[PDB]
A paper describes a structure:
Processive pan-editing of multiple editing blocks within a single transcript is dependent on the 20-subunit RNA editing substrate binding complex (RESC) that serves as a platform to orchestrate the interactions between pre-mRNA, guide RNAs (gRNAs), the catalytic RNA editing complex (RECC), and a set of RNA helicases. Here we report the cryo-EM structure of Trypanosoma brucei RESC1–RESC2, a central hub module of the RESC complex.
We solved the cryo-EM structure of the complex and built the model into the final 3.4 Å resolution map with an AlphaFold prediction of the dimeric complex as a starting point. For each subunit, a small N-terminal domain (RESC1 46–100 and RESC2 51–107) connected by a long linker (RESC1 101–151 and RESC2 108–132) is predicted by AlphaFold but not resolved in the final cryo-EM map, suggesting flexibility within the linker region. In the model, the tertiary structures of both subunits resemble each other, with an RMSD of 1.159 Å. The dimerisation interface of the subunits provides a contact area of 2426 Å2 and involves about 28% of the resolved domain, as calculated by PDBePISA. In each subunit, a hydrophobic patch binds the β-harpin of the other subunit, mediated by interactions between β-2 and β-3 of the hairpin with β-4, β-5 and helix B of the barrel. Both β-hairpins carry hydrophobic residues for binding to the surface of the barrel, but their connection loops differ in sequence and chemical properties: the loop of RESC2 contains charged residues (K195, Q199, K201, N204) that interact with the surface of RESC1, while the loop of RESC1 contains hydrophobic residues (V173, F178, F181). These differences in the domain swap configuration rationalise the preference for RESC1–RESC2 heterodimerisation rather than homodimerisation and the instability of the subunits when expressed alone.
Author numbering:
A (entry chain A): 152 to 175, 185 to 473
B (entry chain B): 134 to 161, 171 to 483
């Protein structure tokens, strides 16, 4: 019903060449392009096209950027080739999901991020200190709803499954990788918001969570405790960017790939159908990319020191 | 169009279309074309990483993360793949062949000034350059390049072998069929090969002025009676001014001529392969093409294609050939700056 885009934008790669004309129809020679202009070109073009698609579909959207490590399954390589074409690598990643996204960031980096990224930027703290929330995932017959719960566990919000229309993966040697996505939420049908508010999803007991959801109403496949701190920046031209810092610890898990505390930083915005007509999404995308690159460069040293993920070929 | 990148989904059967990613062939004028660059590398390196301390990944002790590759290694790997492919094709045929590394500059041309995008990735450029073959190689050198190449040969312990031998090259056309011919200096008919068929051409575009081109070419077998008749027959008379054709009665007309001062430095490489350094000072003499005129000095590597039975180390041979081509380019570079097209 709608096209979707997948991109693996590895940094420090320049797949393009400048076509420099030389005087003596036309004639030219090839020259080395800049280090990473092509990445920004692809990101901006795909963002603009998919945002146009959304606008013609009067669908809301969100530009979601998070920081973590993208670990490829060892089965991605064929015939044991260390070096492979980027186009082939992307077409291989798309076919069967060999990629594994791990949103994380070292604990000690928080002060450095606040002093050298949040404070120098227009980013200012908002909200009321730190808010504790429970993020849960309810699988159903044909859909996978998401639910937010307060300290008591009451149903704060019910949301439909995120649909990703554009999924980019900025990848860096030393620093944490950056995943950039454009997401949409098909409207929750109204009964569901009611259905899940009345029925107690979870039953708190001395800070221990036991599922009490009626089994016919899906299963609580995923559940986690979240400590959320919000920062916001409303720059000129009426575009807002939000830094959500989440200390997340899962409680009820389905698979053994998500079982540890994790610190996540997410840059988010909004692309309303009406606003996007008068909004240059080019600037929003470029600003998000630049901010992500700056923070990745800031935290690269401590990410390497604490996690040791240094991809050297 | 807009799908020139790996976006907008996964089109089915990508491995079939992208199996020959390192080059560009259109199955049934070189058949095989690849374009390289000294600072551009579409290749991405899949390294080995240790995600022992990640959250959620404490049992997996090995994972893969994509990173950038130095363009030297990516070009090495692409050239090795293309060379292995062309070697496989040659060995499938009975063709004997050779790989020549020539020096010069490559110039292209756009069909129409409109719809010309300033910055494109390599593969679409390769597609455009192989669609109608809109390119031209200009082999250039200087007199200082003579001393530079002499010093390079002395450093590489090259053998002197041939010195300043003079020969000629001519082409005879019957119907549209074309014959290449090599003649000895004293108007002696020497060798009657068929024109070179290049199965693989690589435009390795360096950053600086000197530019390297690797070409793998083979000769079809020559049918006996025509070549034998050509051997004894006098084809090229020489007046005191220049050469002239006396081959009319039983041959098609001559189209091209040339005089070659040839200087060959040969040596055995690290592996069991013999390589040559050919210095060719060519004077066009009689020509029919509007661009051939002008004396041209060329420096080339020439390596005969090793046979299948010899079973030479292909990877090491490719590494040595790339290293020697880079050495040639580096030696020629300091002398080659004044051209500026």
């Amino acid at each position: 019903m709608v096209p979707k885009a997948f991109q693996l934008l590895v940094s420090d790669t320049a797949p393009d060449v400048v076509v420099s004309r030389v005087n003596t129809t036309e004639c030219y020679t090839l020259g080395a392009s800049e280090k990473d202009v092509a990445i920004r070109s692809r990101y901006s073009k795909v963002l603009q096209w998919c945002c146009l698609n959304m606008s013609n579909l009067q669908m809301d959207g969100e530009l979601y950027v998070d920081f973590g490590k993208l670990l490829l399954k060892p089965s991605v390589m064929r015939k044991n080739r260390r070096i492979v074409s980027s186009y082939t690598l992307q077409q291989r990643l798309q076919v069967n999901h060999p990629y594994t996204w791990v949103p994380t960031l070292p604990e000690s980096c928080l002060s450095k991020i606040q002093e050298q990224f949040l404070q120098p930027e227009g980013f200012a703290p908002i909200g009321k200190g730190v808010q504790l929330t429970y993020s849960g995932t309810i699988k159903r017959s044909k859909d996978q709803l998401h639910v937010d719960l307060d300290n008591k566990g009451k149903v704060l919000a019910v949301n439909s499954a995120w649909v990703n229309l554009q999924t980019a993966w900025c990848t860096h040697a030393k620093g944490p990788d950056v995943r950039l996505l454009l997401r949409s939420r098909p409207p929750i049908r109204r009964q569901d918001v009611e259905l899940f508010a009345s029925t107690p999803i979870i039953k708190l007991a001395d800070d221990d969570v036991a599922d009490v959801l009626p089994p016919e109403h899906g299963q609580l496949v995923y559940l986690s405790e979240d400590e959320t701190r919000l920062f916001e920046r409303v720059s000129d031209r009426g575009v807002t960017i939000t830094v959500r810092e989440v200390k997340r610890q899962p409680l009820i898990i389905l698979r053994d790939e998500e079982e540890d505390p994790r610190v996540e930083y997410s840059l988010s915005a909004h692309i309303p159908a009406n606003a996007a007509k008068a909004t240059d999404v080019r600037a929003v995308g470029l600003t998000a990319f630049e901010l992500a690159g700056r923070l990745a460069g800031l935290v690269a040293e401590d990410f390497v020191r604490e996690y040791g993920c240094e991809a050297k070929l | 169009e807009a799908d020139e990148y790996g976006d907008w989904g996964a089109e089915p059967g990508f491995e079939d279309r992208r199996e020959l990613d390192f080059m560009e062939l259109s199955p049934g004028s070189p058949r095989a074309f690849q374009l390289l660059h000294s600072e551009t590398a579409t290749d991405v390196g899949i390294a080995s990483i240790d995600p022992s301390k990640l959250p959620g990944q404490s049992k997996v002790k090995n994972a893969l993360a994509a990173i950038h590759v130095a363009p030297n290694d990516a070009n090495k790997m692409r050239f090795r793949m293309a060379f292995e492919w062309c070697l496989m094709n040659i060995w499938n045929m009975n063709m004997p062949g050779e790989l020549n590394i020539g020096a010069g500059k490559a110039l292209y041309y756009r069909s129409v000034a409109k719809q010309n995008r300033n910055v494109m990735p390599l593969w679409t450029v390769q597609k455009h350059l192989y669609a109608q073959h809109p390119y031209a190689w200009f082999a250039i050198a200087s007199e200082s390049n003579v001393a530079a190449m002499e010093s390079l040969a002395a450093a590489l312990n090259m053998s002197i072998q041939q010195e300043r031998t003079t020969s000629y090259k001519v082409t005879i056309r019957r119907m549209a069929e074309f014959f290449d011919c090599e003649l000895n200096g004293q108007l002696k008919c020497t060798m009657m090969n068929k024109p070179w068929d290049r199965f693989f051409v690589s435009h390795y575009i360096r950053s600086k002025m000197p530019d390297l081109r690797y070409v793998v070419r083979a000769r079809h077998p020559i049918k006996k009676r025509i070549a034998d008749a050509y051997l004894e027959a006098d084809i090229l008379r020489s007046t005191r001014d220049s050469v002239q054709s006396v081959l009319s009665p039983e041959l098609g007309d001559v189209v091209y001529c040339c005089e070659r001062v040839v200087r060959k430095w040969a040596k055995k490489t690290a592996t069991g392969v013999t390589l040559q350094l050919v210095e060719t000072k060519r004077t066009p003499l009689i020509i029919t093409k509007a661009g051939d005129e002008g004396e041209r000095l060329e420096y080339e590597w020439i390596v005969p294609l090793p046979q299948q039975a010899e079973r030479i180390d292909i990877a090491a041979l490719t590494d040595e050939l790339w290293e020697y081509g880079n050495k040639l380019a580096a030696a020629l570079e300091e002398g080659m700056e004044e051209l500026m097209v």
